[PDB]
């Protein structure tokens, strides 16, 4: 999901949290 990712990236969180949410 290109859009689900671009959302996670836009969020204000630590890189670990983005990585956590994008892998999961």
């Amino acid at each position, epitope marked *: 999901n290109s*859009e689900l*990712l671009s959302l*996670i*990236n*836009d969020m204000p969180i*630590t890189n*670990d949290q983005k*990585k956590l949410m*994008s*892998n999961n």
Partner: antibody
Amino acid sequence: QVTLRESGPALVKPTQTLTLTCTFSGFSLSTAGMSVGWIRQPPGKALEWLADIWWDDKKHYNPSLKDRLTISKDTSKNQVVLKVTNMDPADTATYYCARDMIFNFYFDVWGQGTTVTVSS
Amino acid sequence: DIQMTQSPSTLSASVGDRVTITCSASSRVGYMHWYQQKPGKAPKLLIYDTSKLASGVPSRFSGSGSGTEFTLTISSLQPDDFATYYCFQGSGYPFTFGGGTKVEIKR
């Protein structure tokens, strides 16, 4: 296989601007999650991260080399460009580009690097 | 920002020896990553996600750690392992590498 090739001047006078280009293949930067970062290695020193950029045009820079850095992309030509202003002999180093993903914030594939010397 | 202290800075060991390299970060980190570099070559990814083996990397290598303390371990050291090893964090900006560890092989 994903490949990356850096290119730019080998020699550059002090105060002059360095313009590096990373041409890659095997993947597209317009793909979600994809990123390209620049990393350099001064003679007899450890690796130093410089900058990166993402498919959504988000950019990051290393505060040490600020505000001398400018990073941009062109997905059409599959390339990323890094500019370093006001070059100093201490900026002499080997410069690398490398792929990155948000699934994994590390550089899995690297270019072979190109060497830049700052001298009169 | 997050700095990385790596030890030992240098090392010499015989083929077959167990070798352990340590990286200690100034602040807490989610994952530690490791890079092997040969002379005049570009760094190759050895270990990612703290303990995961990158592709084409002998199970001889292994990773372990959490918080601010991580270690890389080469079970039975071999000739082709001569290199400089760097840890890498991407958990926060700027990205940073460790000072590096230089591995020489006693023969």
